[PDB]
Structures are given as structure tokens and as C-alpha cells.
Amino acid sequence: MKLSGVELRRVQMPLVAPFRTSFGTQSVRELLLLRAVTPAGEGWGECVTMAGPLYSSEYNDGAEHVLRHYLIPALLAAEDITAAKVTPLLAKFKGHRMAKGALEMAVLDAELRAHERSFAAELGSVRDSVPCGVSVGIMDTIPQLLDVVGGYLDEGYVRIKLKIEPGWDVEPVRAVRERFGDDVLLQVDANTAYTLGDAPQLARLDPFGLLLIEQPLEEEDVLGHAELARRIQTPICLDESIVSARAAADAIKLGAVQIVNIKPGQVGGYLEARRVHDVCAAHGIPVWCGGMIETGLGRAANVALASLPNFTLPGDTSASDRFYKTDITEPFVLSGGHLPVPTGPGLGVAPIPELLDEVTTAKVWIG
Amino acid sequence: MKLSGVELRRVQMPLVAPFRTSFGTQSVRELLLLRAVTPAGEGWGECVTMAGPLYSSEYNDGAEHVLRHYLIPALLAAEDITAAKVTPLLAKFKGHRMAKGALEMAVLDAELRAHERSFAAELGSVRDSVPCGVSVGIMDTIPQLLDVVGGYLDEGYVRIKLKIEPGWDVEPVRAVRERFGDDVLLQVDANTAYTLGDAPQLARLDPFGLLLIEQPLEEEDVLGHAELARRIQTPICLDESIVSARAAADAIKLGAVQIVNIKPGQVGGYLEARRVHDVCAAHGIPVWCGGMIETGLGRAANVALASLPNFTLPGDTSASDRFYKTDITEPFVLSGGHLPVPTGPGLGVAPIPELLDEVTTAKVWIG
Amino acid sequence: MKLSGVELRRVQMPLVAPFRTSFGTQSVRELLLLRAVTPAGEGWGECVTMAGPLYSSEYNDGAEHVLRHYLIPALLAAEDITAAKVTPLLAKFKGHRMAKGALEMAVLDAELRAHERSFAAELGSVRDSVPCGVSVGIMDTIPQLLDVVGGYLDEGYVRIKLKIEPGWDVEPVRAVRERFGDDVLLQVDANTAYTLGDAPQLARLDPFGLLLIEQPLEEEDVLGHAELARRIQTPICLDESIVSARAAADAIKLGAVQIVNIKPGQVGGYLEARRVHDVCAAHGIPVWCGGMIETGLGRAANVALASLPNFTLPGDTSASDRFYKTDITEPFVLSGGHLPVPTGPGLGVAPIPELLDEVTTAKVWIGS
Amino acid sequence: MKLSGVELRRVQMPLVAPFRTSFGTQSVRELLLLRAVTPAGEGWGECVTMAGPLYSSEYNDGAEHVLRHYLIPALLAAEDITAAKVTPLLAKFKGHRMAKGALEMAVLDAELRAHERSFAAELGSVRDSVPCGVSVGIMDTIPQLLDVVGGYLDEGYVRIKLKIEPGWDVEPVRAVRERFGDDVLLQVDANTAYTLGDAPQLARLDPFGLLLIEQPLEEEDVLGHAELARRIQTPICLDESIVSARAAADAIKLGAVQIVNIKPGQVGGYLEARRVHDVCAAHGIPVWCGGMIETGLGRAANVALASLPNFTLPGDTSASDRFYTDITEPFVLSGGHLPVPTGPGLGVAPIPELLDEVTTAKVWIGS
Ligand SMILES: O=C(O)CCC(=O)N[C@H](C(=O)O)c1ccccc1
Ligand SMILES: O=C(O)CCC(=O)N[C@H](C(=O)O)c1ccccc1
Ligand SMILES: O=C(O)CCC(=O)N[C@H](C(=O)O)c1ccccc1
Ligand SMILES: O=C(O)CCC(=O)N[C@H](C(=O)O)c1ccccc1
Ligand SMILES: [Mg+2]
Ligand SMILES: [Mg+2]
Ligand SMILES: [Mg+2]
Ligand SMILES: [Mg+2]
């Protein structure tokens, strides 16, 4: 396979409801989409960067620049290209895992469509549907949270994940546990908002039987997470820190993590994502799939990934209408708390051209 | 697809020269071959068991029985099969990794042929050819050994591996180093033939700068290998002990292994073999591909596997003519110390019926 | 003080000689300069990013973008500004340590000039001049390397650092040792080019008595460096991995490093650089100052930093004419293998406008 | 800058009420004050030594002697001095951290005023006010204590700290918890009064939700503190043991401490105090600022220091009217907080009428 070129497309899609996290409230999602063109056909990738560098150092403009001037040219200059060979060819470029992963996603989509093989087949799926949780952001009031959580439970989601913050942590959890019982799968995500010194306060969440606390401390404080694991009873889940299979290996060796959140864009592609799943499986560490408010493209790839054997916890693979009234692909519709693994070649979904054009704010061809 | 059936075939192929290890001399390789047939097409698998349970608990007759009465029936009874689902379907059957791996190899060959995809593509190859070492057995004299080793170096092999045993260790290595110099990649394999108490004698191998010592102690004495690593300087390579990705993870955690020999049949298939490669890579542990005097079928899958990124030491992926004057497939011919990674769909090679029938001693159809 | 604005100036400076490292041969150094303007006066900062993201994830264009659209706007919106408050104000922007460090450098220059205090005073200098080593890149032949090393020793540099790479390691070190003796302070830098599996080959460096092997493995493989340290004899020095005081603390706790290279831009500024120095001092770990082929501006701040008490090994603070025939500032001239710590307010140095304009390829004003 | 001289002053100041700790009952605080004179201006330093060697080996008379005959001469003999060079210049004198820290304090005030820069600026303050706790000494009865702490809570203090001793520990804590509730920030300090053999009693303090136990065992028993920390559940805080940044580093490496009390005079000055803050911060260890019943001079420097980012627990930086009247502008509590001074240097200076009023001795060491 020789890479003919890549179309970078900048897309803006409005959310049905604002989503508030430890670093801001967002009403519209700005995305970066890649259409890789090979003699065999087209392939699509999605970048999980956002407008600004508030979640990680990568953001849309920087991803677009590094892709346009380094990564895509490097692949275009290669004598032969395959999805597996993408990593060695872009290795001399330090960092930029989300851009690399988006590019690899597009390459792998094209490659697999050429072989009439799905992402689920290539990654090694063993399930035909995946159980799906939902991630509920920070709310302004407690009743407002209880209402949103009850609505999502009525829709059939099998797990609730609450974004927590200093000043908004023990109370919601208590409110949700009191109104909805102890049998609901409940977990929290802190987005690096705490410090090892906040260990007593986080221990106040022990009686509520959460499945996990996701990334309480800073991205690079792996040892601090191992220390925190000794002081609380809720299992520690790492997200922002898990950027590679080697990173998961090291965090496990150090006792810093008991459950791993695999974000394919964050680890540099779905291939590395499978590798993270595999090392965690070898060490007895459960994994689940993380979300980034993706379109149907990334959502489809994520459902494929989430059907692998060591995904023993429901992922952040919600339905399309949880974020978008109109997805740019075939919509993902919740059925009994589950999503069906796509079966078509490649991603099993593709942009609907009229819908994609209505949300396209920019496009450029690199060739 | 749905598995339509499996042709189980017993093959007897004579070796160019006897091959002697700490547990016996092999002169005729008795093998078990599998032909899986689906509506999509054919696939070939090879079992690496031997006639008797001298290397492991698995042997040809026992493999045939467990395949015929448990594994193949279980796969035939599934509504849908994929190479990835072979492991969950055969999970209720404890053990029998080599038979399972052969069955998976045949299913995967058929699956990949249906998609016109090579083993190298599915496993994640990054090289078009692999560098090849050779494994030299125990000899009667030192001059014999020196002549055989020089003959293999003149053929262009890039690494020499010496089978060692009590009474045949320090002297052959000294002889090889004195006759051929310090630049030859040299390593030894003992096949569990030593004991922790023999640690001083193995330390007598320190001055010669071997790459590794392969399986000094027994299959289950992993802790003993960690102790041996504290007592000797030559890096320790585990073979018979590496039966799964979890086994490798555990041995790495215990400081029992610094280089891993991946034998796909021994770990239960090529998919598990890739998982072992990935687990080792996350821990900084180099891997290389192991041999079992396979035919061109297993040899082709081995070359594919050995082209993955963390196979950073030359494997036991020798040419066909080091073992067989003919071989049942298109031969693997050494060119500049390298073997070319097959590019055809599936294994990229298939049996030549004329030759295969000449060496078949039994065949049965299970469907 | 409120920041009135920042001038971003892009500069292109030709090198006296090519400089080759594990990721390329460089003939011209492309730089970012920041001119912070406050009611009290001016301050200068320098970014240590390079043209492309070959050394780290940050590169010139990306640094300029994040500065222009996030960091400088964030500071302009601050009611009160001090160099110390730069870190909390930019905390919500993850990463971009080199851009942040350049901005903090400019703010700190302005603040210290407003208070008539030098960088050396603010950082805690204890000596008036610093000893200087030199970093020599990969060469084409061994004789070329021997000639360059002898020439640099004749200039009076007190330490030699050789860029090493797979295939160009044991031989250059053996050659330098044989010709120039056992008393030359010698050390090597690999720029992440090796792997734990390459441990035997790096052990072949054990007899030549190097001070350190700098960053043999990847940035994020800290455990791998501790394990290499168990298998070899030369002390392990971390460079690319030391991005913060917390990073240094963790590497020391894990046994991954015995000597730390402090690159102020790499850790996000000179205040964090001091913090790294203090952490390493508290654990008995020597530090030395790292270079990024900076102008006289970054060089002045670097010698100031390198005059702190725990910088007990010569840093990559070479003289100006080692890289540039004409520095944009007053030059730094080697005197007996030392450079003098500036004494003026702030950096103790400022760009000479005729010289700076000759090498300026772009400039933009971001302001209120 | 060339030190012109230092005026040594003995100050005797009445406390609002006696203050009792496990090492004695206090009725008047005798202190030692320093007036450094440089050509650029004046600076004031305070020594935290007390009348006798009851808290540490340093006491007022001995501090004055080592200053008058060794430390001040050494600084006077120097061509150029800066606050930073004070430590290297007095380094050949083993020990005497409190005297050196006071001398450094005065030199730094003079230096900072000469550059019209505050202490908070040099140290790197990021907050304009700091939250203040109060330290309550041993009382004669349980109700007597409750009146004192309730009065301190009515004044607006945000944390209550109780001095403990053999015979005064579980009971005062139970009383405060039941009378004043579970939301009061409460901690205890033993001043080395217990042993590892007393570990059982200190385990009885676990149910009441204290923030920490300050210095249970002797200053030099760091290992015993790590042994204790395994055995009890309330966090361990070290005070007397933290005498340098290297000492905090060593205690953290040994697991002997999770919260550090930074006493600038005890660690040898405010510069070292900042270094201790930075070391703990790099290790994820919260710090808080400690008091030594200082005047407004030490109180101003302590408030500045306590406004650095890792002071995440309210320090012993109580209001001036908790002990005194003060020889500077009093520090008046506002909503449980004190304001960080903004003037040059300390931002405060003695009011001559009040300073002379309490001065018992004066001597000039100079040129
Ligand atoms: O369902 C979805 O798509 C979202 C789930 C989600 O919260 N993703 C991550 C996280 O776990 O931090 C995230 C990342 C950035 C902002 C907000 C959230
Ligand atoms: O090139 C080849 O196929 C041979 C390499 C080799 O020695 N394989 C293994 C081993 O490591 O014990 C083996 C195991 C059992 C019998 C014979 C060999
Ligand atoms: O003398 C100087 O300024 C340079 C010294 C030096 O080598 N700096 C670093 C390094 O350590 O790799 C570096 C980083 C990137 C390119 C080239 C060098
Ligand atoms: O509020 C204040 O200034 C005092 C707080 C305090 O108790 N300081 C220390 C200590 O922690 O042991 C101390 C030292 C000497 C005597 C009495 C107390
Ligand atoms: Mg998360
Ligand atoms: Mg073997
Ligand atoms: Mg370096
Ligand atoms: Mg105390």
C-alpha cells in the first residue's frame, strides 16, 4: 500500500447539552477528521484533540500543523505503508500521540476496507455487543445531577460515571447512592484535580462501593497514585497517565493502577490500544474503553476495541444521541444497555457526505 | 465462517543429519498437520509436538486424540468461528497448548486467505526479511563441532546456537570462540538439563560473551532462574517456561528472564505469540523466534512472526535445507543470512501435494 | 504590574560549524525570542525549541502558536503579574514547558530589572564564574573527532562531551582516551538512541572512566534506566527525562539517575530549574547545566543558574564563538575555561539591535 | 554588600496567658533579635531559641555566644556577602541552625529592602492571604480546654491543634470532637513525648479524624516513626526531626512522614525553609508553617513563607493578639486569615518605643 494523500477536514458539531468537566463547560465540539487516500480506497481517522490544550498538551490546531508538516509528509515519502509500519515511520517525531493515532486510524481503516475486514476482526473481537456506561459531567445543583442520572438510567445505561472535583465529590456520590441504591455500577473521574494531600477527603468515598476512582492526581504522578492506593479502599484507575503499553506496564509494576482506561487516541492509535489491552490482560488488570465525545467514526472504532476479552467493565462508549442529535455516520443506538459491534469492512461506518459537509468548517489536501 | 471440517494428517520427514539435545537425538521428525476447511476455503496448521513426551507433556498421539475428541468437535459446534474466538471456545479444556495452537494456526490461515491477507500483515510485520541463526546439536568431538559450525558460518548464518548439556558446555564454547573469534553471535541452550547447584560450572561460561543461556533449569523453577541470574553473568533466556503472555509477565516481574524465546506452538498459537512479543516489549525485554524443526508451513508463519518490531535478536528461523533435503512446500532459501517474509495471502506458502503425499503416514477427516 | 504586551521575534542564526546529533545534522539554529513589555520596562526570554519536533514534542512553530493564542493572552488578562505567578496562571494549559519557560524568562527579566537585581541574585548564586565544558557532535571519521576535541581542549574547555549513537560509541571514546589521556573529563550523550537490550554494548564503555552516560534510553523509560544502572558501571545521567522537580524526585527514588542535567526550558523555566537543583541537592545528586545552542540571552541566564552551589560538574555553557561568529548580545568569552556570571540587572545582557535585526526573520506584537 | 555590623538584642515579652507544652510551662518569652546594618540599609532577624535547651540543644545565651564570636565575625570578614552566600560562609561551623537562620533572616531583610522587594516575592508567593490555625497548650481540666478552643473558634481560627503528652491525649481529643463536632480541622502535637512502646495508646486516637500527629517520638528516631506509621492510621507529621531539606528528603524516602512542619529557624533559615517546601512538594508531601511564639518580625516572614504554593494546611501563623503587645504593626485576623505583607523586605519593622520598652540587653558587633 502506497499513501496517495490525506484530506484534513475541520468539523464543528453542536452538543445536545453542555458537558462540564474540571477544566471547562463545552457546548460545541470542534474536531479534526482525516481522509487517507490510497490506491485501494479511502480511510477515515478521528483526532481526539479539542480546541485548546486543556486536557492534554495536544489541541486541534497543533495536531493539524504537525500532521500537515511532518507526519503526513513522512508517510507520503515512504516506499511502502501499512498500518503497523506507521509507528516506526513516525518514530523520529517525539510526542503527538493523538495526531499519530488519528493518522494510523485512517490508514488502518483504508487498509482493512481493502481486505474487506472489520476493525473488530483485526483487533480480535470476541463479543458481538458491548455494555455501555455514560459519563455525567459536573452539575450546578444536586437535584439537577439526580435528574440527569435518573434519565440516563431510564435509557438503559448499565454504569454511571460522575465527574468529581474539589468541593463536588462526596456529596454527589452520596446523593446518587441514596436515591438509586447500591446495585448501580457507579464510578468517578477527577481529571487530575486532586493531590496526594487530599487523600483523607478521597477516602471519604470508601463506604459507597465505587468501582473505581479515575485519575485523581496529575498525569505524570504515577508514584503518587501508587501511594494513594495504600491510603484508600476504592480501586485506582489511570486514564491521562496511560499513554502507551510501556506506561501501563510501568504503572502496574509500581502498584499505581488496578483498572486501566484505554483511550486509543491518547495512546497513539488503535494498534497500541490493543497492545495496552494485552499487557494489562497479562498482568491481571481489567481494562475499559474511554470516550472523547467522538463522532460515529471514532465511536465505531471504540466499540470494536471494547469488544475485546479483557474489557470486563462497561466503557465510555455511549450512544450517539448522548452528544449529537445528528451523527455524521450511521447512528449508534442503545439497545438493552448495549451497542452492536460494526460488521462492515473497516470501521463499519463512513461519513454521510451531505451531513459531513454541513458541519465542515475547513478542508485541505496534503499530497 | 462455520468450520466444515479438519483433515488431520501424520507426517514423517527425515532429517539431513541427526540433531542431539540434552534429552535425545532426533533423526526423523514426526509431525501432525491440520487442514481446516470452511465455506471460504482451506487453511493449514502444524503441530510442534514430537513422537514422545520428552520435551513437554504433549506428544503426537496425545495431540491427535485431544484434537479429535475435544478441540475440533468444540470448534465444529460453534455457530461462528474466527481465529480470535478459537481461544475462548477451547478455554474450558485445560492445557494442550500446542494442539490448540496448531488448530488456531489452521483456522487463521483459512481466515486470512479469505481476506487475501498475509500472516505478516495480521501479526504486524515491520521488516521484509528476517536475519537467521542456526541451532547446532551436541556433537561427538570438538573438531566435528568446529567443522559443522564453520560450515554453517560459510553458508552465511548470522548467529550460532549450541545445544549444551552436563559434560558438553564450557569446552565447546571455548573451542568455538578460539577457532572463530569474538565477533560471532554465540549462545547456548540446555533444555532444562542443569540444576541450581550446577551454578558454578555455568558461571564458567562468563568470559566468552554469549548472548544468552537458554532454559538452564526446569520448566517450573522460575525463581531458581532468578537466583541463577544473581549468580552468573551470561543473560538468561527462557524457552520451555514461556507458555503464555502471563507466564512471561510473571517471569519478568520475578527477575528470572532477560531475553525471551517465543515458540508459537508452545504458547498456544501465533495470536498468543504476538501477545507475548508485546508484553515483553513493554518491559524492555527482547524476543526472538524459536524453532521446532517445522515444515515450510510452520517455518513461514515463524518468518512472519520474526519480522515483528521487538524480535531484535536473530531467531531459529533457519533455511529449509538445514533440516530437509526436500520439504513439503516451496523451500525457504537463505540469501545473505536472511529469509524473505512471505507475501502471499495467509501463510504465503502451501504444501506441494506430490511431496506431501510421499511423507504422509496417516490421514483422517473430522467433520 | 500588568503585562502591557509581548513581542515574539523569530531569529535565524548560522552556525560556525555543523552540529550533528542522533536526530540530524544542523547547519542553522532557528530560535524564538520574547520581549515582554510592562510599565516598569522590558524583559527578554528565549525559547529552546528547534525547527522540528525531533528532540521533544515542542517545535518553534507550535511554541509560537501556543504562546500567541493561549499563554500570552492568559498573562495579559492577569491583574497582577509576577514571575512566580506565571506558573499558576498557565497551569490550566497542559504541557508546553519550553514555551512557558521562555515566557517566564521574559517576565522574570522585566521584574528583576524593575528591582535592580540580577538573575544570579534571584536564583541564589554562590560563585562569580562557572567552569565550562563543550559538547561535540557526531563526526564523519575518527580523525576528525580527534582534531575537534584537541582544538576544543586548546581553547581551554575543562570537559569534553561526545554525542554517541549505535555504531559510534566505543570507538570514538577509545580513540579520544588513547590520544588525550586519562585525566580529561569525558562524558557521553546518546539522546535516547539506545534500548535496554543494548545494555551489553554500553557496558563496553565501562573501562574508559566516563563521568556519565547521558540519556541512553527513551524519555519515558525511567524504570529502564534504573535497570541499566544495575547492569553497568558508568553513572547514568538523565536529560530529556528531567522535565520537572517531581520528575527528578521520582527518578532518584527509583534509582534511575546519579547525575541530573538541568535544561531550564525543558523543565518550564528557571524557577523550576532552581527547584530541580534543590531537590537533587537534597538527595545527594549532582547537577550541571544543559545547553540548547542558545543566544547570549539564554546563555546569560544559564551561567547565572550554573553558579548555584550544587552545579558541581561543568555544564554545556560553552562560549559564544563555539556556535556563533556574532552573538546578538555582548559575547560570552571563555577565560581559563570559565565564563563570568553577569552582574547587571536582570540577565545582565540585552540584544544589540543592529545585530538582532540582521538575523530577525519575523516579528509580531501581542498586546492590550 | 559588606556587612557593616549586627546589633544583638535580648527581648523579654509577656504572653497573654501562660503556654504549657510537654517540656515546660511558659509565662514570658525571652528572645534574641538581630539588627544587620549594611551600606544599603537595615534588616531585622529573629532567633527562635528559648531561655534553656529544653526544646532543642540551642538556647538564647548559647545562640548569642556563637553569633557574637563565630558567625557574625565570619560574615564581617567577607568581601561580599549575599543572603545566599551566608550558608557557605558559615558552613565550616557545625550545627547552630537557629542562630544561623536568624542571622540569615536579618541579612535577607536588608538585602531585600535594598532592592525594594518583599520576602513573599523572593520566596515565590502566590497568595495574598494565608489561613491560620491555633496551637492550644496543655490545660488543667477538660472543660477548661473546651472553653479555650471554643473561644479560639469564635475568633475565626480555621484549625485547632492540641498539645499532647502522656496523660493528656485521647481524652482531650474525644471531648473536642463530641462538643465541637466532626468538621473542625483538628490535629495534635506531642513534642517527642511518646515512644514506639506507646504505640497502643496513639492507636486510640485513630477514630477521631485528626489531620495528623505531630512529632510523636524523639527527633532522632526517624525509623521508629516509619514503624509507627505502619501501625496507626492517623497521618504522621514530623516537626523537630525536619532540620534541613536533606532531612525531609531522608524521612520521605524512609516512609516516616506524610506531612512536614516547616519551622524556618529550625531548618537554618527561610532560604532552606523554601528548599524544604520544594523538596516536599516534589514528593507530594503537604507542608504547613510552624510557629515558635515569634514577634511580628518572625510572624511576617512566616506569613510570607506560608503563602507559597505547597502550604496546603493552615500553619501555626496565629494572630499577634494570641500571644502578645507586638513590637510591629499587629497582625490582625480577618476571616481566619492573615494578610501577606507588601512592604519591602519583611514589610514590618520594630516600633522603637515598644522595642526599647521590652529590651533587656543590647550589644554592637561591627566595624
Ligand atoms: O462519553 C464520552 O465520550 C466522554 C467520556 C469522558 O469523560 N472522557 C474523558 C475522561 O475520561 O476524562 C474526557 C476528556 C476530556 C474532557 C472531558 C472528558
Ligand atoms: O531451528 C530449529 O527449528 C531448531 C532450534 C531448536 O533448538 N528448537 C527447540 C529448542 O530450543 O529446544 C527444540 C525443541 C525440541 C527439539 C528440537 C529443538
Ligand atoms: O552546548 C550546547 O549548547 C549544546 C549541548 C547539547 O548537546 N544539548 C542538548 C543535549 O544534551 O542533547 C541538545 C538538544 C538538541 C539538539 C542538540 C543538543
Ligand atoms: O502558634 C505558635 O506560634 C506556636 C505553635 C507551636 O506549638 N510551636 C512549637 C511546636 O510545634 O512544638 C513550639 C515550640 C516551643 C514551645 C512551644 C511550641
Ligand atoms: Mg478520564
Ligand atoms: Mg530451546
Ligand atoms: Mg542531552
Ligand atoms: Mg511542633
Answer whether C338's CB lies under 8 Å from C130's CB. yes
Chain A and chain B touch, per 3+ beta carbon pairs within 8 A? yes
The C-alpha cell of A162 is what?
A: 460522575
The helix-helix angle for D270-282 and D97-114 (nearest 10°) equals 100
Tell how far the Cα of C317 is from the centroid of ligand 7, in angstroms.
13
Tell how far the Cα of A189 is from the centroid of ligand 1, in angstroms.
9
B278 → closest Cβ in A82, A87, A275:
A275
Residues of B with CB under 8 A from a CB of A: 82, 84-85, 88, 115-117, 121-122, 124-126, 244-246, 248-249, 253, 271, 275, 278-279, 281-284, 309
Supply the residue whose CA is at minimum distance from atom 5 of ligand 2: B291
Residue of A nearest to C59 (CA): A66
d(CA B41, CA D218): 79
The C-alpha cell of A192 is what?
A: 487530575
Reduced to 3 states, what is the DSSP secondary structure of residue B29?
Answer: strand
Residues 6+ apart with CB under 8 A from A112: A43, A83, A118, A119, A121, A122, A345, A346
Task: Give chain D's end-to-end CA distance (angstroms, integer).
Answer: 14
Closest Cα partner for D361 from D11, D2, D6?
D11
Residue D263 designated active-site: yes
Measuring CA to CA, how many Å separate D345 from each of C108, D85, D119, D271?
Answer: 19, 18, 5, 14
Task: Give chain A's end-to-end CA distance (angstroms, integer).
Answer: 15
Strands C338-340 and C360-367, sheet pairing:
unpaired
What is the nearest CA distance from B254 to chain C, expressed in angstroms?
A: 13
Closest Cα partner for B271 from B113, B114, B88?
B88
φ and ψ of C92, to 5 deg: -70, -15
Rg (CA), chain B: 20
Measuring CA to CA, how many Å separate D69 from each of A34, D4, D80, D106?
Answer: 76, 16, 20, 17
Reduced to 3 states, what is the DSSP secondary structure of residue D30?
Answer: strand
φ and ψ of C19, to 5 deg: -125, 115
3-state secondary structure labels for all residues of C85-99: HHHHHCCCCCCCHHH
Tell how far the Cα of D313 is from the centroid of ligand 8, in angstroms.
14
A196 → closest Cβ in D209, D211, D284:
D284
Chain B and chain D touch, per 3+ beta carbon pairs within 8 A? no
φ and ψ of D237, to 5 deg: -120, 130
Ligand 1 atom nearest to A215, measured from its CA: 12
Measuring CA to CA, how many Å separate D205 from each of A12, B32, D171, D188, D211?
Answer: 57, 70, 9, 10, 11
d(CA B138, CA B299): 23
Chain B and chain C touch, per 3+ beta carbon pairs within 8 A? yes
Ligand 4 atom nearest to D316, measured from its CA: 1
Closest Cα partner for B29 from B60, B53, B2?
B60
Q: How does DSSP classify residue B50?
A: B
Closest Cα partner for D262 from D301, D226, D224?
D301
Answer whether A12's CB lies under 8 Å from A29's CB. yes
φ and ψ of B137, to 5 deg: -75, 180
Ligand 3 atom nearest to C23, measured from its CA: 16
d(CA A51, CA A89): 27
Measuring CA to CA, how many Å separate B191 from each of B215, C54, C346, D259?
Answer: 6, 45, 69, 54
What is the nearest CA distance from B285 to chain C, expressed in angstroms?
A: 7
C214 assigned binding-site residue = yes
The C-alpha cell of B305 is what?
A: 512472526
d(CA C84, CA C76): 15
The C-alpha cell of A11 is what?
A: 468539523
Concatenating the DSSP letter of every residue in A304-332 gives HHHTSTTB-S-BS---GGGT-SS-SSS--
Collect all residues of chain A within an 8 Å Cβ-Cβ radius of residue B124: 84, 271
- The method recorded for this entry reads X-ray
Measuring CA to CA, how many Å separate D305 from each of A19, B108, C81, D298?
Answer: 39, 67, 19, 10
Answer whether C112's CB lies under 8 Å from C346's CB. yes
Collect all residues of chain C within an 8 Å Cβ-Cβ radius of residue B210: none
Answer whether D67's CB lies under 8 Å from D103's CB. yes
Collect all residues of chain A within an 8 Å Cβ-Cβ radius of residue B309: 87-88
**Residue A241 beta carbon below 6 angstroms from any ligand 1 atom:** no
d(CA B189, CA B212): 8
Q: Which residues have CB less than 5 Å away from ligand 6 (the ion)? A: B 189, 214, 239
d(CA B322, CA B318): 7
**Residue A55 beta carbon below 6 angstroms from any ligand 1 atom:** yes
Closest Cα partner for A28 from A60, A1, A5?
A60
Q: Which residues of D are annotated as a binding site?
A: 135, 161-163, 189, 191, 214, 239, 293
Alpha helices in D72-221 (DSSP H): 72-76, 86-89, 97-114, 119-123, 142-154, 170-180, 199-203
The C-alpha cell of A87 is what?
A: 509507528
Cβ neighbours around B70 below 10 Å, total = 16
Answer whether B115's CB lies under 8 Å from A116's CB. yes
Closest Cα partner for A62 from C176, B104, C213, C95?
C95
Collect all residues of chain B within an 8 Å Cβ-Cβ radius of residue A245: 278, 281-282
What is the nearest CA distance from C65 to chain A, expressed in angstroms?
A: 8
Cβ neighbours around C189 below 10 Å, total = 26
Tell how far the Cα of D135 is from the centroid of ligand 4, in angstroms.
7
Concatenating the DSSP letter of every residue in D42-68 gives EEEEEE--BSSTTSSS-BHHHHHHHII
Residue of A nearest to C240 (CA): A94
H or E element at residue A44? strand A41-47
Distance between alpha carbon C120 and the CA centroid of its chain, in Å? 17
What is the nearest CA distance from A217 to chain C, expressed in angstroms?
A: 13
Domain ranges of chain D: 1-115+352-367, 116-351
Pocket of ligand 4 (CB under 6 A): D 21, 55, 135, 189, 191, 239, 290-293, 316, 318
Buried b (16+ CB within 10 A) or exposed e, B335-346: eebbbebbeebb
Measuring CA to CA, how many Å separate B109 from each of A122, B101, C274, D10, D41?
Answer: 14, 12, 60, 92, 87
A227 → closest Cβ in D235, D284, D313:
D284
d(CA B260, CA B245): 11
User: How buried is A117 (Cβ within 10 angstroms: 0-12 exposed, 13-18 middle, 19+ buried)?
Assistant: buried
Cβ neighbours around A152 below 10 Å, total = 19
The C-alpha cell of A238 is what?
A: 489511570
Closest Cα partner for C331 from C289, C356, C301, C296?
C296
Partners of C28 in the beta sheet? C14
Residues of B with a known catalytic role = 163, 263
Residues 6+ apart with CB under 8 A from A207: none
d(CA C112, CA C132): 26
Q: How does DSSP classify residue C292?
A: -
Collect all residues of chain C within an 8 Å Cβ-Cβ radius of residue B286: 197
